[PDB]
Amino acid sequence: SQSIIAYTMSLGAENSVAYSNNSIAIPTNFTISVTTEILPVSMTKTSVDCTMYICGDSTECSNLLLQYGSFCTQLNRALTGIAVEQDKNTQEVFAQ
Amino acid sequence: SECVLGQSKRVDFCGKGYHLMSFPQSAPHGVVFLHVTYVPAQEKNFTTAPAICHDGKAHFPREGVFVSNGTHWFVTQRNFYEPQIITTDNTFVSGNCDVVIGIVNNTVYDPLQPELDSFKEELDKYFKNHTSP
Amino acid sequence: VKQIYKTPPIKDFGGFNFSQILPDPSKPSKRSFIEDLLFNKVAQKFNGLTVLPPLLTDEMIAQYTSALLAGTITSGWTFGAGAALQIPFAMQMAYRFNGIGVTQNVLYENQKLIANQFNSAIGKIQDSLSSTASALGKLQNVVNQNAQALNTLVKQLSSNFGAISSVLNDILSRLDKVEAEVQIDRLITGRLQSLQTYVTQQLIRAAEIRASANLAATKMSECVLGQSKRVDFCGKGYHLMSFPQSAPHGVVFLHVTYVPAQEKNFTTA
Amino acid sequence: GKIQDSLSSTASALGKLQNVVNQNAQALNTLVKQLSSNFGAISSVLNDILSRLDKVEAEVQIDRLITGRLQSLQTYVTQQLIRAAEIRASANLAATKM
Amino acid sequence: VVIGIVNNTVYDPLQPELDSFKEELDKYFKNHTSP
Ligand SMILES: *[C@@H]1O[C@H](CO)[C@@H](O[C@@H]2O[C@H](CO)[C@@H](O[C@H]3O[C@H](CO)[C@@H](O)[C@H](O)[C@@H]3O)[C@H](O)[C@H]2NC(C)=O)[C@H](O)[C@H]1NC(C)=O
Numbered sequence: 266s267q268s269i270i271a272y273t274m275s276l277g278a279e280n281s282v283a284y285s286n287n288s289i290a291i292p293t294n295f296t297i298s299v300t301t302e303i304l305p306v307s308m309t310k311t312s313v314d315c316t317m318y319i320c321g322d323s324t325e326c327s328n329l330l331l332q333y334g335s336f337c338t339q340l341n342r343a344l345t346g347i348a349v350e351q352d353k354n355t356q357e358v359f360a361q
Numbered sequence: 362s363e364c365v366l367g368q369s370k371r372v373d374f375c376g377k378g379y380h381l382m383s384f385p386q387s388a389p390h391g392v393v394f395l396h397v398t399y400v401p402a403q404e405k406n407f408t409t410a411p412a413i414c415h416d417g418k419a420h421f422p423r424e425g426v427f428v429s430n431g432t433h434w435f436v437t438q439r440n441f442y443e444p445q446i447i448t449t450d451n452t453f454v455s456g457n458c459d460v461v462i463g464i465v466n467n468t469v470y471d472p473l474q475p476e477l478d479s480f481k482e483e484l485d486k487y488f489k490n491h492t493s494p
Numbered sequence: 495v496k497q498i499y500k501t502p503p504i505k506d507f508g509g510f511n512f513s514q515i516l517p518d519p520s521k522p523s524k525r526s527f528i529e530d531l532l533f534n535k536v537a538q539k540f541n542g543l544t545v546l547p548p549l550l551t552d553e554m555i556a557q558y559t560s561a562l563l564a565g566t567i568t569s570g571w572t573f574g575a576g577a578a579l580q581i582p583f584a585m586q587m588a589y590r591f592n593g594i595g596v597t598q599n600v601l602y603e604n605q606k607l608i609a610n611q612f613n614s615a616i617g618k619i620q621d622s623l624s625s626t627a628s629a630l631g632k633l634q635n636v637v638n639q640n641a642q643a644l645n646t647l648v649k650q651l652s653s654n655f656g657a658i659s660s661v662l663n664d665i666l667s668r669l670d671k672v673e674a675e676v677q678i679d680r681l682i683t684g685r686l687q688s689l690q691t692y693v694t695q696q697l698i699r700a701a702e703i704r705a706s707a708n709l710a711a712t713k714m715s716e717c718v719l720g721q722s723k724r725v726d727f728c729g730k731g732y733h734l735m736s737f738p739q740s741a742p743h744g745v746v747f748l749h750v751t752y753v754p755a756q757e758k759n760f761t762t763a
Numbered sequence: 764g765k766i767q768d769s770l771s772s773t774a775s776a777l778g779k780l781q782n783v784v785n786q787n788a789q790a791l792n793t794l795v796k797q798l799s800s801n802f803g804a805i806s807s808v809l810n811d812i813l814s815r816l817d818k819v820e821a822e823v824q825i826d827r828l829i830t831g832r833l834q835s836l837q838t839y840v841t842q843q844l845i846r847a848a849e850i851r852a853s854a855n856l857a858a859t860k861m
Numbered sequence: 862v863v864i865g866i867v868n869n870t871v872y873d874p875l876q877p878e879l880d881s882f883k884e885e886l887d888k889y890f891k892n893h894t895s896p
């Protein structure tokens with residue numbers, strides 16, 4: 266019975282409002298409803314030792330990498346900034 | 362801040378509709394809000410008049426809009442039907458009939474006049490009562 | 495909006511003329527007169543790029559624009575909250591003026607003039623959009639940076655990156671399995687690295703639009719669906735209301751703002 | 764009146780701006796410092812590579828600098844755009860505040 | 862206490878209603894002089 270169907274998407278149920286130069290609508294009853302809203306506040310912290318990752322536990326690899334300048338310390342600084350910003354986000358949102 | 366620490370007038374920000382209050386609840390790596398919104402449910406058609414003439418002077422609803430159920434004119438809040446008797450302490454005078462478009466005729470009850478009417482009858486009767494002595 | 499509204503057959507707006515912004519039945523696409531200027535103003539290639547068509551096409555996007563416009567002009571701001579409740583347009587301004595702290599009596603006492611003033615003002619943007627060329631820079635920019643990136647991205651295919659040619663087939667045509675191994679190895683790095691930069695370039699700009707869309711959505715929910723007391727958030731001046739109007743890869747508002755004219759000094763206590 | 768004295772008494776009042784200028788300053792020094800890194804070649808001096816090796820293979824070692832020194836430049840600008848967007852988010856926030 | 866306050870009368874809309882009845886009451890007692 267069930268099968269794959271493709272169709273022009275419905276933008277919604279059409280509703281022609283009863284507009285007139287003297288026709289007004291006023292609500293007689295209400296519904297105090299509640300809706301949920303979801304927002305990420307922080308991601309998992311992560312610190313990746315550049316040398317332990319790319320030249321993990323290898324003195325020769327670390328020595329060869331040291332020729333590559335300050336790349337690894339740049340990445341470490343960036344990730345420490347990410348972690349401190351995660352704490353900053355949580356602190357700012359929940360420390361009002 | 363604008364939903365929890367207070368009420369926000371920003372429509373469609375703290376939930377869908379007129380916002381009332383928001384209850385935060387923690388979550389893993391996130392937050393989840395519970396926006397309490399006021400959503401009108403039952404509506405009805407009505408006859409409206411931009412303004413009201415009383416004695417050539419025009420009248421406008423201080424708070425709410427002029428509404429009529431077909432026979433009698435009333436004023437009610439725009440977001441909830443609570444018709445009120447059109448009274449002077451419910452409206453303010455401005456201009457006259459010749460300017461307002463769509464204005465209609467109906468008398469506006471000054472609350473002071475009927476109150477003093479009882480005093481008028483007491484005043485009139487005492488003058489008749491003062492004839493005997 | 496969860497209910498696609500349609501414009502009423504009558505145009506009894508008490509002198510207000512919305513002909514430009516309502517969709518024109520003459521055009522097969524149900525778009526309005528204003529975006530005709532805007533739309534005019536603004537398949538896999540062998541290179542490997544593609545273009546994915548938007549899920550919401552121009553017609554349906556324009557249909558959404560009509561719906562958002564219908565509730566504002568007929569139901570006021572109410573249809574943002576719940577069910578749409580019709581209120582004739584005259585008393586709509588009577589409360590928007592009440593929003594700015596101006597008594598509603600002024601509107602009825604000045605209904606025809608402001609209606610003529612509003613329609614004349616609506617006429618101004620019609621010529622202003624047509625007469626000016628750089629007024630639509632933002633949309634034209636976003637298209638341009640996206641366009642020039644691909645052109646730059648494609649042009650990268652002709653850079654040798656240190657290889658003896660930029661035709662990967664030619665490298666296979668003239669070197670054997672092992673010699674061409676070196677050249678292709680160098681060649682792919684540059685192709686990958688250039689693609690790396692392009693994708694990273696794409697994300698940053700995409701994040702900017704995401705903020706813009708979030709800014710647009712907030713403007714959609716605040717400027718249009720209601721009256722925003724946030725000064726100079728919705729047009730320069732005291733806010734009354736606004737109209738969305740679709741455009742290629744963008745949105746355009748029409749803020750209707752109240753601004754005081756000539757003034758008089760006075761002595762106060 | 765307390766704002767003037769309190770601002771002039773503590774040194775942590777302007778942490779945000781001092782951090783902003785530091786980050787843009789610190790990144791520039793790293794960009795400059797990377798010029799002195801060999802990046803796996805024989806020497807980090809651009810002229811010295813030319814003055815010690817014949818042109819048959821001197822292009823090979825300097826090629827590593829080209830891949831290298833550019834790579835740091837690519838990272839620096841990438842850091843800049845990440846910071847450029849962040850400031851505009853603050854600037855747009857400041858725009859609304861103003 | 863107000864700095865910059867000036868002088869003016871504050872009109873009472875209650876007065877004309879009482880002024881109307883005060884003047885109207887005057888002739889009613891005048892008429893009662895006839896008997
Ligand atoms: C529109 O609203 C009017 C005001 O609420 C309403 O008028 C009121 O109608 C009721 C009856 O429905 C009257 O109640 C009277 O009913 C009998 C009728 O003979 C009297 O003997 C009673 O003593 C009682 O007073 C109200 O007096 C009357 N009020 C006014 C101010 O007119 C209309 O009926 C409503 N019309 C519709 C169509 O909804």
Ligand SMILES: *[C@@H]1O[C@H](CO)[C@@H](O[C@@H]2O[C@H](CO)[C@@H](O[C@H]3O[C@H](CO)[C@@H](O)[C@H](O)[C@@H]3O)[C@H](O)[C@H]2NC(C)=O)[C@H](O)[C@H]1NC(C)=O
Nearest residue numbers: 410413414415416417418458459462463464465466467468
């Ligand atoms: C609201 O009430 C007004 C007064 O109660 C009413 O105006 C009145 O209209 C009648 C009908 O024309 C006038 O009567 C005379 O009008 C002209 C002279 O202007 C004569 O040629 C006619 O034959 C007739 O005798 C009243 O003079 C006039 N009174 C006032 C104060 O304007 C409005 O028409 C009513 N409007 C609505 C919408 O109900």
Ligand SMILES: *[C@@H]1O[C@H](CO)[C@@H](O[C@@H]2O[C@H](CO)[C@@H](O[C@H]3O[C@H](CO)[C@@H](O)[C@H](O)[C@@H]3O)[C@H](O)[C@H]2NC(C)=O)[C@H](O)[C@H]1NC(C)=O
Nearest residue numbers: 760761762763862863864865866867868869870871872873
């Ligand atoms: C607004 O009008 C008020 C009523 O006239 C006025 O108050 C009156 O001020 C005068 C003089 O300023 C006082 O007259 C007394 O002033 C001193 C003592 O204070 C004496 O040297 C005088 O001979 C005289 O006794 C009135 O007593 C005083 N009356 C009241 C009821 O306050 C205000 O000053 C006026 N306001 C302004 C801004 O001018």
Ligand SMILES: *[C@@H]1O[C@H](CO[C@@H]2O[C@@H](C)[C@@H](O)[C@@H](O)[C@@H]2O)[C@@H](O[C@@H]2O[C@H](CO)[C@@H](O)[C@H](O)[C@H]2NC(C)=O)[C@H](O)[C@H]1NC(C)=O
Nearest residue numbers: 281282283284285288289290291403404405406407408502
């Ligand atoms: C309020 O009334 C409108 C229509 O006005 C009515 O017109 C006559 C039928 C008569 O009854 C008048 O006294 C009324 O004022 C309603 O709009 C209609 O809604 C129905 C949906 O059931 C729709 O099929 C019609 O096309 C609409 N007509 C028009 C002209 O728009 C409106 O629904 C009424 N309000 C409520 C809450 O029901």
Ligand SMILES: *[C@@H]1O[C@H](CO[C@@H]2O[C@@H](C)[C@@H](O)[C@@H](O)[C@@H]2O)[C@@H](O[C@@H]2O[C@H](CO)[C@@H](O)[C@H](O)[C@H]2NC(C)=O)[C@H](O)[C@H]1NC(C)=O
Nearest residue numbers: 752753754755756757758759760761762763865866867868
């Ligand atoms: C309202 O008035 C001010 C100044 O008050 C005037 O001062 C005297 C000359 C006297 O005539 C008062 O009754 C006046 O009200 C105006 O400020 C002046 O503006 C003119 C520009 O036309 C300028 O050349 C002057 O330098 C201004 N005055 C000062 C002291 O700088 C103000 O413009 C008036 N408002 C309007 C709308 O005209």
Ligand SMILES: *[C@@H]1O[C@H](CO)[C@@H](O[C@@H]2O[C@H](CO)[C@@H](O)[C@H](O)[C@H]2NC(C)=O)[C@H](O)[C@H]1NC(C)=O
Nearest residue numbers: 292293294295296297401402403404441442443
């Ligand atoms: C407004 O709506 C509410 C619920 O939608 C109505 O409350 C119900 O009223 C009926 C009879 O009036 C009761 O039998 C139900 O038990 C009520 N519900 C609840 C949850 O208590 C309310 O009556 C409506 N008011 C008007 C004026 O229409």
Ligand SMILES: *[C@@H]1O[C@H](CO)[C@@H](O[C@@H]2O[C@H](CO)[C@@H](O)[C@H](O)[C@H]2NC(C)=O)[C@H](O)[C@H]1NC(C)=O
Nearest residue numbers: 505506507509510511512513514527613617620
């Ligand atoms: C709203 O304004 C438009 C623009 O002027 C009006 O359209 C014009 O109507 C006149 C009337 O004869 C024509 O001569 C013009 O050619 C129309 N303009 C165009 C571009 O075709 C429209 O009629 C107005 N509508 C209302 C209700 O006022």
Ligand SMILES: *[C@@H]1O[C@H](CO)[C@@H](O)[C@H](O)[C@H]1NC(C)=O
Nearest residue numbers: 285286287462463464504506
């Ligand atoms: C509303 O419009 C109808 C026809 O379009 C007209 O007969 C009626 O008089 C109008 N009402 C007002 C108050 O202008």
Ligand SMILES: *[C@@H]1O[C@H](CO)[C@@H](O)[C@H](O)[C@H]1NC(C)=O
Nearest residue numbers: 486487488489490491493494
């Ligand atoms: C009339 O006046 C007398 C005294 O003046 C008083 O005792 C009596 O109650 C009054 N009666 C009425 C009906 O006013």
Ligand SMILES: *[C@@H]1O[C@H](CO)[C@@H](O)[C@H](O)[C@H]1NC(C)=O
Nearest residue numbers: 762763862863864865866867
């Ligand atoms: C306002 O300033 C003038 C000086 O130009 C001064 O004479 C006047 O007293 C001041 N107003 C008040 C209420 O003190």
Ligand SMILES: *[C@@H]1O[C@H](CO)[C@@H](O)[C@H](O)[C@H]1NC(C)=O
Nearest residue numbers: 888889891892893894895896
């Ligand atoms: C006094 O009032 C009577 C009515 O009760 C009236 O007929 C008479 O003319 C009045 N007297 C005067 C002097 O106006």
